[PDB]
Amino acid sequence: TAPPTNQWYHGKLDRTIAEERLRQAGKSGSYLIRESDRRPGSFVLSFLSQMNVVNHFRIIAMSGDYYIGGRRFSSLSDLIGYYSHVSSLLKGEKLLYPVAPPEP
């Protein structure tokens, strides 16, 4: 289980706007996924931590799968599910609140 793509995918988005969108949300645990403008075709999980620091994690898409760290997921839904319910993304912190783009 994970929210639908329209609820958290922003397309190609630079880090500055990504952080602004998360700080407009303003809640620790807010997250989004974006295509990197600097490394096109690869993705980024952007996450607002309990310390009001946005953390950015690369997600590499290969063969219709997604890799973050050394971990393989078959869908972004499965990746979000894993870091929402199964494993901490940061020490003591999981994905909580999907942030949707102001435009779909």
Binding site: F57, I68, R71, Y83, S88
Partner: peptide, 12 residues
């Protein structure tokens, strides 16, 4: 331009 720095999850 200098690239931004990315993090790795706690479990990796």
């Amino acid at each position: 331009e200098e690239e931004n720095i990315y993090s790795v999850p706690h479990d990796s």
